[PDB]
Structures are given as structure tokens and as C-alpha cells.
């Protein structure tokens, strides 16, 4: 097992086609144990989990909550046990309000919105860190999850903002871990189908969004060398799992591409 | 005149030594017909830019008023003339509350201000393009103050997430300014001596700030190929009004570095 | 007059559609008073420089020959007349057998042919450099032209591999012109309509590469917020003049994007 | 085992600090099956491997040896057994004549001299995976070394152009490697100490040279935020075996910076 004794935090699952989904199956098929957090809807996270590999203690996290960070690491320690520390911290958490993505033009986002966008998306890495850096081994590993920000792009808008300020919080979260002996790196990936996609290209957002993000998709997929289906989530996972692992021990601050090698090519 | 004829609006002007103060001079030395703003002490800005060679109306802007920005490009048609349109627009705002750069620790900069920090330096650049777009002529050039933020550096901490969510910011302001013919780009500076970044060198934010900022700025001069003076705005200056030129009309979503080829050199 | 009372050689010129003719047109518009090279047909060459806007003495230069290159200096100063100094050089010079780019496989392309093409696109700006770095004057500028090899691309092959060694080559000189107070940069433009681009798309190297070309150029447009005229070589021009001013001052080991704001954009 | 039943071609062993030998011994610890290359001195390079944890085949291939190419995967097959295949293939090859490198100045390393250097460097990356496709099952895994050489640093030279132009070569073997289900990649690696690198910070190649690269380092360790040890390869070794793993299944045509996260801070 990749992961075998690793005790992880992996953070993100919604539903069973949450990128965290899929990251915590491989991880546990791999030998860790986790511990998950979930957002708003308790009750459904509980339920999706059921389908684990294996069962995992659930603490509520709202990272925007001050009380539900300043208390995290109490949970995790009583749920993983006194004396027992985290090797892993799995961020896989985003949000952007819709007026930040639509066919909404990007100039008429309102501050507010793209704030919350930015608060959810790029700066909770950071209170993530903050709040789990002092219950992780010497060793550990925080991965984030990422979407190639560096050019611009139809209908992710803000978003794409919010992604840009994340690799650069990246960037200063690994200062701080590495004080901890902990490596921090985010995991750039390809589209993936969540719902809130499959909802984007069916139209949820404006009909030229979705046509633009459907076009997004089959650029990728030609472009990368060895093709990217974005029905499956599992190469992003494994890959995330690489991370978590003692396998790249002296990467840091960094970005690795799970997109099907992709942002290499021009077309 | 490099820029004869050419209406523009500089922003940022606080004290003499402010990099807009300078971009205004150089501008109007080439020919340039200004119009400035200025945010909260505009006696002082007043009285400052009396000295600039050549007199220019000066309109109040708070980048998080929503009434100044409503209004800004009826105050500017104003100013310049019915009928009459800007050909360029210098975005040199910045601001991050000193939580979240000092020797105050990384993670314990709250929210709120990191908020307001990218509020007013990253989201403020699309603000004004906004306001500003519809009294642009076709062929005009929109130009912001950038810091690269593409390493993570001591003490700038937030104020380069800041400028990470600028140049992405950037990227999609260029998309808008396309449709009317507009370029949007990033003057990517050197460090300068402002009195802010005197004040942090004389250790107003923490002395071991204060310390890794003189580092910073040596190392700086010694990787510059053709070296690098803290102390001279005015090759930052040129290089801004060398974009508001008709010189680079094919460069766009793009940043350019006038910072003494130092970015290009690793020692 | 932007580059007024500049002395500057311009290498490259073969056809009336090269980017070096454009360039020297564009520069004695300028002010400029201009040396010519140019490498092999210098009868031809000497026809269509005929048609600059001003005479401009031309001298043979095979950037292969060791022997060229070393009297290059002195055919220059006698060219601009002893205790005058070259304040610009354009290197405007690139080629690559076709078996490094056809639909001729990438590993096909035997070490010999290869290394012919890195010797003249690439190793040359070192050379050019070398021979004109002693007749050059403070604040002085060589510039390079360049095509965008930071991801992989179709039937560009080897040439991309030859830009990426280029851009590097680049880095270097800005060290060495450093110590003379001379700016070393490449400008990076978009595809232009050259013969041999013409040629190509046309299939005179396989079909397939002349489709991958055609449509190559085709997303270029879509993509550059401003868009992009392949048949215009005229905003290049421009910029590689913006370089050999004295309006880009700090900027140097550098690139600079003239493509439409291109890559900048993702779709 | 990471790497269990995996057979994996391993080059570039010289003496027991080669980075490929530490290479060989992380990926035998891991349950590969190994054939090695080496190219001129065979006796000892039989001698060194002996060391290996397990037995390995050595073929010889000097990668400026069209014949060596054009037997390799014959040789190989023979060595693995017909109708079984490579899983990896490791490229840890790297050559400059000293004129390219030394306190020689960058303008004085004649043509012959780099482009035996590229064609050792760059080229062979290509050759290397011409030869050995066809012999790669699915899934396959080529992994060169590579040092950032996307900033101009003192004394490599034109090692960094080699640099350059192999990352790039990297991108279009993705190309063709994908045809074959096979990944592509680069590990930028920290500088470390062989017996090379020694030699140089000794004063090899001039005294000035050994003192930029001494530099060199120590701000490689002060920068990384968790650290860089330039006697120790193993952290680099690994990075390699995850690679070659089936752990990073979506990367391709990419560069995994083992280096401590130095390339992600400016200080
Ligand atoms: N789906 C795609 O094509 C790609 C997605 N990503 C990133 O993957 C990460 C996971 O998103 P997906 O699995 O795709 O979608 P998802 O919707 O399954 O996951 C988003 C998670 O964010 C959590 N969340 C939202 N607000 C929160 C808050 N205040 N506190 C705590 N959690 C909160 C949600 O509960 C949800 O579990 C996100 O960062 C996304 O940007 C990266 C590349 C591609
Ligand atoms: N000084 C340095 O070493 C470098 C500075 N920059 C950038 O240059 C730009 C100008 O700053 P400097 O001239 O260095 O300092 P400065 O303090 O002279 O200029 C900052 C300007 O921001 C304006 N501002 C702050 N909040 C505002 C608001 N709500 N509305 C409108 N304006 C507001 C201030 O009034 C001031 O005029 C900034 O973006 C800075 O980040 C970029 C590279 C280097
Ligand atoms: N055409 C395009 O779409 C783009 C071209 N470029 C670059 O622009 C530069 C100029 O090429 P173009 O004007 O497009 O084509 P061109 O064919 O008009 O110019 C190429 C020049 O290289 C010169 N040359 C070749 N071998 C030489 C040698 N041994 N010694 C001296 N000169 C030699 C040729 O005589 C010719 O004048 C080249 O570096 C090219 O790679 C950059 C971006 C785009
Ligand atoms: N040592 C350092 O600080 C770093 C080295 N690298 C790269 O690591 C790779 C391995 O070099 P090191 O282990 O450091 O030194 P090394 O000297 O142990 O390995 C170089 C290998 O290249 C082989 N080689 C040279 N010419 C050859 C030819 N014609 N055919 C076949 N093989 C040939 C040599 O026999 C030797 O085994 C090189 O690509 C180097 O550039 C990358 C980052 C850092």
C-alpha cells in the first residue's frame, strides 16, 4: 500500500463524483486512514461515505467558520486518538458565486461575491494549514486542488482568479510547512464531470458558458499527448496520492499536472 | 512626443515619489494631456502634483466606491470634453492592511484584510476598466503596477497574492478590452523607494521584515544584468509609457518587466 | 522620430515579406540610419533593399562563417565611418533543414541536420553579438526574433527546439552585454506570412503539416484578444522598434510577446 | 515494491555518485528488474554496478553511435528475453565540453564544442526514445534529468542552453511517446554533488566558476523551503521512481522539480 500507517485528512467530498471522492477510495485501497470533513449537508456527506472502502470518522468543516478551524485539530486528535498525528491534509474545496462564472459578465461580479469565492477558494488553503500544521509528522504532506490558471479561459472567469491567488498562497504555505519537516503542493487538473460541471455544460450558466466549457473539454483531450477523459477522476486521485506518499520528498511549494500532459502542448 | 495627443488618466499619485507621479511626469514630457485621481487626501495630492510640468484636472476616486466608480467616466468626459475620449489609463493602486505583510506571521493575517488588499491592488484593475472602457477610443491602452509574484519572497507575503490575482485579473480585463480595441497589460517593476517601502526598510513592519526587504533589493542589483537603482522611478515611467505608445500595438493580456533583466537571472 | 539619429544593423532581409524588411522599413521611418546584412544572394538582396525608404549600405554575412564574423566590425565601422558606434543590432536570422520539420517524424531528423538549424537560428545570436558587442554603445539594444516554444506544437518540430535553445542563448547575452550598458531581448511574434510560411501551408513539407499550419494560424486569431493578421508583419515591426528605443530601459534577458496577446489565452 | 515486476533500462552510471546509480538502486529496492547502459568505460562501469542490490545486464551505448542506436533494442530484447518488454526507460546522459563551461567566456565555446554537447544532452533524449518505443509496453514511462535552466546562472553555460533545448525535446517526444500508451517527463533536480560537480567547485574549470557554483548551492538550501542537500541523491532518485510508477498516470510531456522547492522562492 502507497499509503500504508498514513493518517490523512482529506477534505471536499459533496457527492460520489467529488474529486475527493475518488482520492479518499484510492488513498484507503492504499492503506491510510482518514479522517474526513464535510461541509454543509452532514447528513448526505454520511451517506456517500458509506461507500468508502472503509469507514472514516466525519467532522463538520465550514471554512469560513473562525470556530470550526480554531477547533479542528481538537476534533481530528479525538477522532485519530491522543499521541496520534496526521501525515496527510487533502484540500480539494472551491466555490465561486455564479455571478463570477456565467455568460455573467466579468466585470459585473460583484465584489462581495468574488470575495467569498476567493475567501472558499484560495485563502482557506491557508486556514486549513494553520489549523492542521500543528497536529502533522515530521515528513507530512498538504495537496491542493487546482486548475491551471496561467492563461485566461471563456466562463471560469473569477474562478480563474481565485485558482491564481491559490498557487501563490501555495507558494507561502510551504515557508510555513516547511518549519513542520511538511511538504505543500497543489495538484493542477484536467475537467473533470462533477455534477456542478455536467450542470455547466447542460446550460446552467448560460448557454454560451456551457458551449465554450464544452469546447474547453475537447481541446484537452486532443491536445494531450496521452488523452484526458474527464469522466475519470481516478488519474487525478492517483496522482494525489503520489503526493501524500514519501515518493516525491523533495517537492514543495509546487504544481503538479494530472491534466493528460496537456498545458504542454499548443495544440 | 511619444505620446502627443494622447489623453490619459493616471491614478495613484500620493506623494512625489509615488511610481504614478512619475509615469504622469514622463507622460506629459511626451506630449500627453492627463487627467489624474487621486483617493483620500487630494488637498495634499493637490498640492503635490502642482509640481508636475504641466496642469491636469484631478477627480477624486476611492477604488471601493461604488458611487465614485458609477460616476468616474461622466467626471472624465467632464474633464477632458464632450465628444473627447481617453486613449490610455494607468491602474498604480496597492494596498494590503499590515496584517498581512509584516514579521506578523503569514497565516494570522484575518480575512477581512487580506479581503481588502485584493479588493483594492487585484479587483479595483477591473473596476476601472469597467468605468473606464466605454470612454475609450479604439487602439487605447489600459496599464496596471505589478511585482512578480510568480516566487513566493519574505515579508510581501499577501501583497503578492494580491498581485497574483492582478496578473490574472489582467488576462481576462484584456478579453473586455479587445472588443474595443483596447490593449490591457502589466508593468512588472523593480523596487522602488517609496516612502512605504523606506518605512519598511527602516523597519516599520518588523526589523527582520525590514532586513529580508534590504536582501531582497541587493540581490536584486546584483542579478540585473544592467543593475538595478532603487532610487530612479524613471525607467519604470518610460517603460509604462512606452505601452501607452502605439510601440507594442500587438501585446496585450501580457506583463512586461522593467525591473533590470533581474527575473531572468537566477544568480 | 523614435529611434532618431540611431545607428543600427538589420540582418535577415531575403525577400520583401521578411520580418527583417519590415523591420528596416518600419526603423528608417524612425530616424534610423541603418547597416544591412544579409547572406547569400546578395544581388537579390541588394534589389530589394532598393526599396527601403533610404539607401543603406549592405554587407555579406554567412553567420556560419567563422571568417565573416570576424571582420564584421570592421566592415561595419567602415560602413558607419571610424568613432561611429552601432547603437542597435537585429538579429532576424532562422533555418532549419526540412527534415527537422516536416510531416518528416520528429525522430527522423538526422544529429547533422539539426545541429544546422540550432548553429544558425540559435548559437548565431551569440555570435552576432560577440562580433558587435565591442562597436556598440552604452545604452545600446540587440534584439532577436523569436516564435513561442515554451509548449510543443505540429510540424514546427525541431525550429521549436532550436526558439527554446535561442531564448536561452538570449539570457546569456543580456549577461555579457550587460558589462557594454547594452539591452539583450527577443521579440516573440505571432505567425506571419512569410514565402516559406506560404510555402508551407501550401504542403510544400506534406499535407499534414500544411493542415496543423493552417490551422495553427486559424486559433491564433480566435485566441489574441486583439486578434491577428498574419499578413501584417507591421505590428512586429513596430515592436522590435519599441526594443531599439530608449522606451524600454529595464528590460532585458527578456521576451517580449507580439502575437495578438495570444498566448495569454487558453481559448 | 513501487516499482514490482516493472523492467526498466537505467544509462548514465559512471561511478557510484552518478544520480543514475542511486537511481538503480531505489528502483531495484523496489522490484524492478534492470538492464543498464553505459557508454565508455564498461570495465568500470561493470565494476560500480556490481554494487547494485541485484544483478543487471550492461550494454554498452555511446548515444553519438548511430550503430549502438540502431542495435539497442535488439540487444535489449536479447537481454530481457523475446516477447517481454521495457516498462522505463532512464535518461541520466549529460556532456559539455569544458569551452562551454569554464570561466571560458560564454562567446568563446566555438560550435563543434556545443553541438557536440546539445547532441549529447538534447538530441539523445530523442534518440534514446526512437530505439526504444518500439520495444515499451503501454503504460511505459521515459524519465530524463534535467537542472532549471529557465533563469541564466554563472559557469553552465551552455549546459543551460542543453538544458533548454532538452525540456523541449521532452515535449515532442510526449507526442510520439503517446502514440504507444507511454509517458514522457523531465526531473529537475537539485545540484548535487558528483564527482564532477566537485571537481568544479574545486576549482576545475577556474576559480571564479567553482565560487559562483558554490553560491550556487548555498542559496539553493536557504531558499528550499524544506531544505537541499547536495550530497544526498536519493531524494532525487525517488522522484525518478515515481515516474516511472504507475503513480503520476496523467502526467506527460512535464518536469518534476526534485530540488526542495527552491525554484518556487525568490529568497
Ligand atoms: N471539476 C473540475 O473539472 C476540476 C476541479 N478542480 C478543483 O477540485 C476541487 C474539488 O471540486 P470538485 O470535486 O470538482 O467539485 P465538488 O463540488 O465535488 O467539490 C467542491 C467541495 O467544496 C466544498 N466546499 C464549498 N464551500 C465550502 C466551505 N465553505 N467549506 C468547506 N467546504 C466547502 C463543497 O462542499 C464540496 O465538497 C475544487 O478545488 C475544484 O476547483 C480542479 C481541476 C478541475
Ligand atoms: N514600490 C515598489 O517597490 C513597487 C511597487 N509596485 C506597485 O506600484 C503601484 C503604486 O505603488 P507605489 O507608487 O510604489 O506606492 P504609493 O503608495 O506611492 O502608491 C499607492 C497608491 O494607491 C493608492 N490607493 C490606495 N488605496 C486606494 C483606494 N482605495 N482607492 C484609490 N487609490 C488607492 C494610494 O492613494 C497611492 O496613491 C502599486 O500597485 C505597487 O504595488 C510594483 C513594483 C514595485
Ligand atoms: N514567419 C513567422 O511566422 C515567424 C518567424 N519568426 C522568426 O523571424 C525570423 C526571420 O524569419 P522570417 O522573416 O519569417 O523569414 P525569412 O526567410 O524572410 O528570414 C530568414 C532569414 O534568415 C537568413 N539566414 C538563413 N541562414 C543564414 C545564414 N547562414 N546566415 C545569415 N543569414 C541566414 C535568411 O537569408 C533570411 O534572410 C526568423 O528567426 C524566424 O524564425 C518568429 C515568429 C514567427
Ligand atoms: N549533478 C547535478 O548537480 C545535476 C545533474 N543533472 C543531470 O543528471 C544527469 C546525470 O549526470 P550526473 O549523475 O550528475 O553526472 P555523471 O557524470 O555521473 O553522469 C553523466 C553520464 O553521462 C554519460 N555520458 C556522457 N556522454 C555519453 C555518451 N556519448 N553516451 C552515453 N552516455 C554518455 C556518462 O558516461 C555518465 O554516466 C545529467 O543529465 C546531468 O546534467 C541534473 C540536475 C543536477
Chains 1, 2, 3, 4 share one sequence.
Not at 51 to 70: G, I, T
Not at 252 to 265: C, K, P, W
Request: charged share 20%; glycine share 10%; net charge negative.
Amino acid at each position: 500500500g502507497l499509503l500504508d500507517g498514513k493518517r490523512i485528512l482529506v477534505s471536499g467530498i459533496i457527492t460520489d463524483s467529488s474529486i475527493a471522492f475518488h482520492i479518499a477510495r484510492v488513498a484507503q485501497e492504499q492503506g491510510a486512514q482518514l479522517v474526513l470533513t464535510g461541509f454543509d449537508r452532514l447528513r448526505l456527506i454520511q451517506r456517500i461515505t458509506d461507500r468508502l472502502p472503509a469507514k472514516a470518522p466525519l467532522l463538520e468543516l465550514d471554512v469560513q467558520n473562525e470556530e470550526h478551524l480554531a477547533s479542528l485539530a481538537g476534533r481530528v486528535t479525538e477522532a485519530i486518538g491522543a499521541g496520534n498525528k496526521l501525515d496527510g491534509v487533502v484540500h480539494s474545496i472551491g466555490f465561486m458565486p455564479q455571478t463570477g462564472m456565467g455568460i455573467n459578465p466579468f466585470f459585473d461580479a460583484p465584489y462581495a461575491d468574488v470575495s467569498k469565492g476567493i475567501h472558499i477558494s484560495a485563502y482557506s488553503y491557508a486556514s486549513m494549514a494553520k489549523a492542521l500544521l500543528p497536529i502533522m509528522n515530521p515528513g507530512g504532506s498538504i495537496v491542493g486542488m487546482d486548475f491551471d490558471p496561467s492563461r485566461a479561459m471563456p466562463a471560469y472567469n473569477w474562478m480563474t482568479v481565485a485558482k491564481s491567488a491559490l498557487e501563490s498562497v501555495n507558494r507561502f504555505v510551504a515557508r510555513e510547512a516547511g518549519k513542520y519537516g511538511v511538504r505543500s503542493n497543489l495538484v493542477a487538473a484536467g475537467p473533470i464531470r462533477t455534477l456542478a460541471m455536467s450542470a455547466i455544460v447542460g446550460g446552467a450558466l448560460g448557454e454560451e458558458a456551457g458551449a465554450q466549457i464544452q469546447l474547453l473539454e475537447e481541446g484537452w483531450d486532443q491536445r494531450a499527448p496521452i488523452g484526458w477523459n474527464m469522466k475519470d477522476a481516478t488519474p487525478v486521485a492517483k496522482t494525489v496520492c503520489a503526493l501524500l506518499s514519501d515518493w516525491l520528498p523533495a517537492t514543495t511549494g509546487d504544481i503538479i499536472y494530472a491534466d493528460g500532459g496537456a498545458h504542454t502542448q499548443l495544440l
